[PDB]
Amino acid sequence: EAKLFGRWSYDDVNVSDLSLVDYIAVKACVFVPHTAGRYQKKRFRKAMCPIVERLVNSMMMHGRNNGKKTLSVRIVRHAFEIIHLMTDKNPIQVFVNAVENGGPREDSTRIGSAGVVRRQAVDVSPLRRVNQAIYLICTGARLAAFRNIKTIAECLADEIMNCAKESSNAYAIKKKDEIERVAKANR
Amino acid sequence: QRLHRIRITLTSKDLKSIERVCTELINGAKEKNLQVAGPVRLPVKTLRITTRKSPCGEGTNTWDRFELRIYKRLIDLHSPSDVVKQITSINIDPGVEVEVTII
Amino acid sequence: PAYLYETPLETRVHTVKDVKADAFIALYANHLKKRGRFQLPKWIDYVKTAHAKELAPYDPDWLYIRAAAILRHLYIRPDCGVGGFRKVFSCRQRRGVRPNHTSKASGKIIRYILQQFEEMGLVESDPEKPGRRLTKNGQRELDVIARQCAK
Amino acid sequence: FQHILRILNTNVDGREKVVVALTAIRGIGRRVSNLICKKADIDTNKRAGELTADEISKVVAIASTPQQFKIPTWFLNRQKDVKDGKHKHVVANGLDTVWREDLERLKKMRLHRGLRHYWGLKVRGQHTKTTGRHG
Amino acid sequence: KKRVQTFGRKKNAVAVALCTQGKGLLRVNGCPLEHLQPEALKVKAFEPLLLLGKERFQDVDIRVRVSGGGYVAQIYAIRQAIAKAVVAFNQKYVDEATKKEVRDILVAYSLIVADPRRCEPKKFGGPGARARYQKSYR
Amino acid sequence: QPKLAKVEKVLGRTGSRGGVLQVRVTFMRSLIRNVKGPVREGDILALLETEREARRL
Amino acid sequence: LFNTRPKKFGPGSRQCRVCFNRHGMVRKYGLMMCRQCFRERANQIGFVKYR
Amino acid sequence: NHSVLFDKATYDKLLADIPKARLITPHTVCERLKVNASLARQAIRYLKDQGLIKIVGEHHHSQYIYTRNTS
RNA sequence: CUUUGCGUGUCUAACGCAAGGAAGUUUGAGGCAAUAACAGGUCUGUGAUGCCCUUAGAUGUUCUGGGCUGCACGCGCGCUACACUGAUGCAUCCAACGAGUCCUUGGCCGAUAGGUCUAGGUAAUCUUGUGAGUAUGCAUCGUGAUGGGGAUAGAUUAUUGCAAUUAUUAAUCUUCAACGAGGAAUGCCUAGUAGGCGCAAGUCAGCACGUUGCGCCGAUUACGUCCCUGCCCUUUGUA
């Protein structure tokens, strides 16, 4: 069985692309995004959590909004309902396809060969690309609704659908290409 | 004589001082074979003071964490008061406050 | 996809604890008007319900819902009084520039509603025993409308 | 429909609810404006851009003489007037002139408190080494 | 009569779930599980019902008595105490082979274990436990 | 565009601050590359440049 | 007449028995001990610090 | 920026306007319209009771979120 | 016991990973703390003290009153903020550390503070199961410096004290500023931890925006490194 909010089934659906596979934790699965459990003793317990839990967990910011997971459960429960409303299929399959495309491919590290702070082209790991994906999803949605009288759930639902899409309107998909602008040049 | 009920309080700072008394006075009762219940160990009232270590303000503001501990323990009996005076009066301990009470 | 799950048996509707507590107050507030008995204060224009609160309540039936809530709360904890009911409707006062603290509820309004229940005789002393309690007629007033609201 | 308004020689705005619109009048605030709205029998659901001639006429009467409609005295701004010696409600540009009287009273009397208004320092006894600096 | 009683522990919460033979009613203090706000976590309490099934629990009843902790910690105590009850209900009366099924399907899904994370004490020269205040320099 | 490659073994850890990490990959062939985040053996990752081999160390 | 105000309350009322000093007066459990005085004699009273 | 009353020109349109749209929220009324969010709540509460539209979920006290009825 | 399995090592000392287990970083967190010192700080913690000062027209002592709070302006620790994951009004129901010869239930009066008449408590017994607040549910508000923000200011009612003015606080009504995420610099921190949210104790007649403990809600990101800032041990150079 196992369904999120009881209205969705973990069973069925699929990972979008090779890589970022097995790093993601689907398959089995827990109704309700939330789980208080030990995930930070080893350094790859972080990709045992299902990514809906990692969304609600990292959705609390900044100092003022931290904690209150029960609050972040609600606004994600509304967000998955809205995703369903447009281009209806599976909120999870749209969300999994979003965090596939969300994070950056390559990155600029500072290796100078002694003396200088000089940039150099380095590809990103599969774990960090999932870490950066869910971070960049939220920081678009939070900044989008920070001053506007638009509910955060609306921003999150909108941000996720956009990320799956190639519109580039999103903050996340821009900040992918903003890094890949400089990462091309640092080759 | 008459059917009475006695419940004797014990208090001290040390654990080791009372564990003499709890073992001794129950065996002192079992000379005469009175209706003993075992020693009821109450929760420990830990007293606490935290002062600064330094006399003046200088250096990092470091602190002591001083503690006392107090151990209320209760030997239960059902026996008249003339019988118990032999048991308590012999085997008094150094620095252990003890008070016998009917009911 | 509809919502899953039940309990094994269909839940018994008899006592007041089986009723959801907010939905109880929605019914019994309306019962106080349509019956008529309970009677109004003079001061209703003023108040706000607490020293801590900085504004008066919006809903004009704030007294009936409070008298509805306090009467069921006697069933939850039998023994309680006025300083008890000051704690249960406590709240975060905002001190100003300073950090926040707790504060106790209003003593006039919480005492008065109990005296109106004493006049009918649903909640009563207890003159020697410290704290108010609901009587026999108090329970049957509650438990008859517990079955009605779920129906 | 009426955009913009004026009650008691002070400009009340439209596009605001009737309770909060009345706080734009000087010497009125949030808790008393509810008692004005409740005892004038105005619906709080209505908007301050409307306000018929019956509604404003009641508010001016209550604002002038709130002792008539059983407001029990602790709600009033200048409670015990210290001139005629009664429970008094000061509204609008009366409150400007009353503040001009009460400060210039204390300058003639020559209190310490009056000299703080004269120099324009902090009055209430606050540590002005560091705070209230810029001026 | 058939009786077992069991406890769970999240943090400083504790929840003694007595259970007996009966009709099929699961109750906290004297509510239904249908209440238990926050409501969002209401689904969380029903977790051992969904995994094991309805038709096991209808032979028994459970009555839980809870204190300590907070809002969320009280749910996790009840979560454990219901799951620990029906596992421990076998040992006394019902066949001992079916314990290995009903326990290990829940373990395949810390419902009996209880995670011992407790609050580390504060130390001097700082606001939090490990956090410190601020160094000034010049 | 991007073409996938499987990790044989972590080689060391590279750079001044030690954050970037050096890996032998195998296409899906072998060459040495640098990678950012947490990586272990039995792992697969995308590369835009199939060429461009990192210095041995 | 002279040599006495009302001396009932506040730090001027009371002093350290051991050293006659008002400042840093530990009055928990009725010690009446100035802190410089209290810390060095704390083991002899009963107080033993741990954790 | 926004208009506070019903605007009884647009009330005749507002029967037609909102059941067209796929999303029905607080925001989508003042998207189509240029009025404060508050009217939108009493609009979609009116369109529950009188008119067509239906809840996506039974309810919530913060984010409403209706669909078009499709009938 | 790092027990068992497989790797890693002159397979010696011991590491890594997986399974099992309440727990496998020495299981987590503290107390205790060497030899050398530094012209560190404290004669204002002391009946710990040498020397000097002054000793009745006093630097002893003590009484009335003021001052340490005085403001063109710099610097350091904190608190509340800028909102809609929100503010406000109603309802729902959950903690642990204390602490009292003062802590306060119960009943009447009062919008409030608070008062008044009884009443339990030398305390696992009474206050107290301290019905704590972030939280949850249902309403109104609508992006406006607005109901976010509560400084600044007038007027009134109680409380502690022998005395409240430079206002000790707590209330009730008003008064409605700056501030739209903070320039250069730079602090703290690796799991029940950060951060947020309260509570209790210490000083206390009265006063916490402070410190010391206590729980509750509970994340993100490392599991490496010697680039910056310091540290320890070798070889090396020194005027």
d(CA H7, CA C5): 47
Residue A143 touches chain F, beta carbons under 8 Å? no
Assess contact for E29 and E65: CB atoms under 8 A.
yes
d(CA D103, CA E72): 57
Q: Which two tokens stand for residue B13?
A: 């700072």
D115 touches strand I (CB under 7 A): no
d(CA C146, CA C26): 12
Domain with CATH 1.10.8.50 in chain D: 1-72
d(CA A60, CA D106): 55
Q: Which two tokens stand for residue H5?
A: 């009353």
Residue E64, Cβ neighbours under 10 Å: how many?
A: 26
- Full domain range(s) for residue E118: 1-138
Residue C33, classified by CB atoms within 10 Å of its CB into exposed (0-12), middle (13-18) or buried (19+), is exposed
d(CA E97, CA E85): 16
d(CA A166, CA A184): 20
d(CA G32, CA D90): 56
* Nearest C-alpha neighbor of D48 from the set D10, D4, D93, D113: D4
What secondary structure letter does DSSP report for F12?
E
Which chain I positions have some atom within 7 A of a protein CB? 18, 22-25, 28-32, 40-42, 45-46, 48, 61-64, 69-81, 83-86, 88-101, 104-114, 124, 128-144, 146-147, 150-157, 161-162, 165-167, 170-176, 181, 186-199, 201-206, 208-227
Q: How many domains does chain E have?
A: 1
**C103 strand-pairing partners:** C91
Contacts of C30 (CB under 8 A, 6+ apart): none
Assess contact for A107 and A180: CB atoms under 8 A.
no
Q: Which two tokens stand for residue B44?
A: 């420990």
The DSSP result for chain E, as a single string, is --EEEEEE-STT-EEEEEEEESSS-EEETTS-TT--SSGGGHHHHTHHHHHH-HHHHTTEEEEEEEESS-SHHHHHHHHHHHHHHHHHHHHHTS-THHHHHHHHHHHH--TTT-----PPPP-SSSSSSS--------
Assess contact for D66 and D86: CB atoms under 8 A.
no
The DSSP result for G1-51, as a single string, is --S----SSSTTT---TTT---TTEE-TTS--EEHHHHHHTHHHHT-----
d(CA A59, CA A98): 16
Helix axes D53-64, D30-39, angle to 10 degrees: 120
G24 touches strand I (CB under 7 A): yes
Residue A107, Cβ neighbours under 10 Å: how many?
A: 25
d(CA C118, CA C137): 12
What's the number of CA atoms in the CB half-sphere (13 Å) around residue C37?
9
d(CA B49, CA A138): 48
Quick one: which H or E segment has residue C115?
helix C107-120
Assess contact for B78 and B6: CB atoms under 8 A.
yes
Q: Which two tokens stand for residue D27?
A: 């010497």
- Closest nucleotide to the alpha carbon of H42, via C1': I140
d(CA B64, CA C106): 44
Cβ < 7 Å from strand I, D residues 89-108: 95, 98-99, 102-103
Which chain D residues have a beta carbon less than 8 Å from that of H4? 14-15, 47, 49
* Nearest C-alpha neighbor of A123 from the set F41, F7, F9: F7
Q: Is A67 left (phi over 0), alpha (psi -120 to 50) or beta?
A: left
Residues in chain A: 187
Q: Cis check for the bond before B39: say yes or no (omega within 30 of 0).
A: no
The DSSP result for chain D, as a single string, is ---S--BTTB---SSSBHHHHGGGSTT--HHHHHHHHHHTT--TTSBTTT--HHHHHHHHHHHH-TTTTT--STT-SBSS-SSS-S-B---THHHHHHHHHHHHHHHHHT-HHHHHHHHT--SS---TTTSS---
The architecture that CATH gives domain A1-187 is Orthogonal Bundle (1.10)
E123 touches strand I (CB under 7 A): yes
d(CA E35, CA E42): 7
Which chain E residues have a beta carbon less than 8 Å from that of A34? 41, 44
d(CA D22, CA D20): 5
d(CA A33, CA A25): 13
Alpha helix stretches (DSSP H) within C38-106 = 62-76, 82-88
Measured at the CA of D115, the angle between CA D112 and CA D117, to 5 degrees, comes to 120
Q: How many domains does chain C have?
A: 1
Experimental technique for the deposited model: cryo-EM
d(CA A134, CA A163): 11
End-to-end alpha carbon distance in chain F: 29
The type of residue at F52 is R
Chain D residue with the nearest C-alpha to that of H6: D47
Q: Which two tokens stand for residue D61?
A: 């009467």
The domain ranges of chain B are 1-103
d(CA H18, CA A151): 19
CATH of residue E138's domain is 3.30.230.10
Q: Which class does domain D1-72 fall in? A: mainly alpha
Is D75–C56 a contact, with Cβ atoms under 8 angstroms apart? Answer: no
d(CA E130, CA E124): 10
Query: Which residue is associated with the tokens 């007294």?
Result: C63
Assess contact for D38 and D27: CB atoms under 8 A.
no
Question: What domains can be seen in chain F, in order of their start residue?
Answer: 1-57 (2.40.50.140)
* Nearest C-alpha neighbor of F41 from the set F18, F57, F16, F21: F21
C84 touches strand I (CB under 7 A): yes
Assess contact for A36 and E74: CB atoms under 8 A.
no
Longest dimension (CA), chain E: 76
Torsions phi, psi for A59 (to 5 deg): -85, -5
The 3-state secondary structure of A88-153, one letter per residue = CCCHHHHHHHHHHHHCCCEEEEECCCCCCCCEEEEECCHHHHHHHHHHHHHHHHHHHCCCCCCCHH
CATH topology of domain B1-103: Alpha-Beta Plaits (3.30.70)
How many Å from the CA of A62 to C1' of I151? 26
* Nearest C-alpha neighbor of A51 from the set A82, A78, A74, A20: A20
Contacts of D71 (CB under 8 A, 6+ apart): C45, D32, D35, D39, D62
Give the distance from CA G38 to its chain's centroid: 8
**B98 strand-pairing partners:** B10
Question: What domains can be seen in chain G, in order of their start residue?
Answer: 1-51 (4.10.830.10)
Q: Which two tokens stand for residue G23?
A: 């400042």
- Full domain range(s) for residue C73: 1-151
